Amino acid sequence: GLSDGEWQQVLNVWGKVEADIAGHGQEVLIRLFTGHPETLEKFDKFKHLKTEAEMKASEDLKKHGTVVLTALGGILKKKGHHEAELKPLAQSHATKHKIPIKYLEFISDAIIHVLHSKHPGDFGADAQGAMTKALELFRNDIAAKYKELGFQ
Numbered sequence: 001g002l003s004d005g006e007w008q009q010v011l012n013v014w015g016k017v018e019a020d021i022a023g024h025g026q027e028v029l030i031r032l033f034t035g036h037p038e039t040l041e042k043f044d045k046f047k048h049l050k051t052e053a054e055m056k057a058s059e060d061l062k063k064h065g066t067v068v069l070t071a072l073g074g075i076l077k078k079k080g081h082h083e084a085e086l087k088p089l090a091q092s093h094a095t096k097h098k099i100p101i102k103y104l105e106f107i108s109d110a111i112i113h114v115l116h117s118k119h120p121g122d123f124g125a126d127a128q129g130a131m132t133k134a135l136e137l138f139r140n141d142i143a144a145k146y147k148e149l150g151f152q
């Protein structure tokens with residue numbers, strides 16, 4: 001897992017996100033959808049968004065960004081002791097939403113990109129290393145639940 005020092009870096013970085021949860025959430029989803037248009041097709045409520053302008057202007061997209069990052073933040077604050085929080089998310093994403101694990105890799109990469117974009121020069125090598133590890137742990141625990149379900 002992550003060391004105590006690594007968790008402290010993760011949660012320090014997360015303070016930056018919490019100062020503007022909707023803004024970070026919106027940018028993460030826009031990075032995901034523009035980089036990987038197939039992902040948009042999993043959202044019946046966003047498939048009408050035909051341009052980035054329309055995405056940027058969507059209050060509902062910002063709302064979902066808030067829901068996503070709030071869930072992720074609750075998970076990160078558990079510092080790996082996240083079974084109860086993570087199991088239901090993994091199961092809804094496999095069974096209801098049909099989200100392949102590759103798309104979770106995509107959104108993980110989008111989070112790292114958005115952190116650099118919004119905090120250039122303020123997201124250092126140690127911070128990126130710790131946040132990467134945290135997102136890998138998140139993805140890996142979801143993947144174990146996916147394997148249990150035989151999903152993908």
Ligand code: HEM
Nearest residue numbers: 039042043045067068071072089092093097099103104107
């Ligand atoms: C950081 C990773 C993610 C987190 C924390 C997250 C969290 C959530 C939460 C809390 C919900 C609402 C509750 C639920 O249905 O379980 C949700 C819904 C949903 N998620 Fe995610 N999600 C993540 C990644 C993804 C990705 C990568 C996709 C697709 C590419 C996706 C697709 C969906 C869809 C289609 C819904 C239903 C939206 C609606 O119609 O209301 N999620 N997610």
